[PDB]
Ligand binder design. Structure first.
Ligand SMILES: Cc1ccc2nc(NC(=O)CSc3nc4c(c(=O)n3-c3ccccc3)SCC4)sc2c1
Length: 286
């Protein structure tokens, strides 16, 4: 009923500019994730996003793209099925992750973003929902998904201001709130807020009161810019504050020192005496 060998199932979620459905590859006897886009939509993107996935193929933690085409009223992208998102797993774990789990995640997540940047793209929506654990033998592997908002940043793109927020406000960089064109530094700053989100259970600019929706962004921006990093990270290892400070110090077109940032957390990991066995909090449920 789709691509001759795929059967469409129930709806399991939504991404940028489309919904994700469960499917079965009948010939291979394997489940897949299927993203649908109305063929007649005013701004078609799916075939663009699929070209990005096809170009990222072979990178660690990039989902495999099995088929792309058009059936009936829909453009179709068939992907390997992945496991739960870090947001789902965070909620399943009662919104508290151990330091070991945060550091295991940080190590992989920095690498995913570096890989995307190595392919001349910035993700621009770094958030727990867009990182998924693999299934089965890949269950220790963090995947990144959803390139619907991705953009090619290179010869670097020029410095531009006054550009509406393209991403989630909660994890957006301060530069993004100021209207500055996003670049590599902003993906990493967003990751920094995600890590503090995992440590705290919430960020201090969550749950602010506002009506007309522009007011909400104003208030998030204000709180984010008036919350010093040392206050945000108080009571947690200094490496997280150093990480955020480093990202906030990056120039627009700087190539981030990914190795330095990973080594920050690796050194903390070793000082804690943790083992790199990939045993996350959720793997210890009986
Ligand atoms: C672009 C892309 C690529 C891969 C991919 N993999 C995904 N995996 C999941 O979302 C988790 S599996 C799952 N999620 C949900 C329900 C669900 O029933 N499943 C599921 C699917 C198959 C077998 C068992 C459970 S109910 C609503 C949320 S998103 C996704 C999106």
């Amino acid at each position: 009923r789709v691509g001759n060998r795929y059967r469409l199932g129930r709806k399991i979620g939504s991404g940028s500019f489309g919904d994700i459905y469960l499917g079965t590859d009948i010939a291979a006897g394997e489940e897949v994730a299927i993203k649908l886009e109305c063929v007649k939509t005013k701004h078609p993107q799916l075939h663009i996003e699929s070209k990005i996935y096809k170009m990222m193929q072979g990178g660690v933690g990039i989902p495999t793209i099995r088929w792309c085409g058009a059936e009936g009223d829909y453009n179709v992208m068939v992907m390997e099925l992945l496991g739960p998102s870090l947001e789902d797993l965070f909620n399943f774990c009662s919104r508290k992750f151990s330091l070991k789990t945060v550091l295991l995640l940080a190590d992989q997540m920095i690498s995913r973003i570096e890989y995307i940047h190595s392919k001349n793209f910035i993700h621009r929506d770094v958030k727990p929902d867009n990182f998924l654990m693999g299934l089965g033998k890949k269950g220790n592997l963090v995947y990144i998904i959803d390139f619907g908002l991705a953009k090619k940043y290179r010869q670097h793109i020029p410095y531009r201001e006054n550009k509406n927020l393209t991403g989630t406000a909660r994890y957006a960089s301060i530069n993004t709130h100021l209207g500055i064109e996003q670049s590599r530094r902003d993906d990493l700053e967003s990751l920094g807020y995600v890590l503090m989100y995992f440590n705290l259970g919430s960020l201090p600019w969550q749950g602010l009161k506002a009506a007309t929706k522009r007011q909400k962004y104003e208030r998030i921006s204000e709180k984010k810019m008036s919350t010093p990093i040392e206050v945000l990270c108080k009571g947690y290892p200094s490496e997280f504050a150093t990480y955020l400070n480093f990202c906030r110090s990056l120039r627009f077109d700087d190539k981030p020192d990914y190795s330095y940032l990973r080594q920050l957390f690796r050194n903390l990991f070793h000082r804690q005496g943790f083992s790199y066995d990939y045993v996350f909090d959720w793997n210890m449920l009986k």
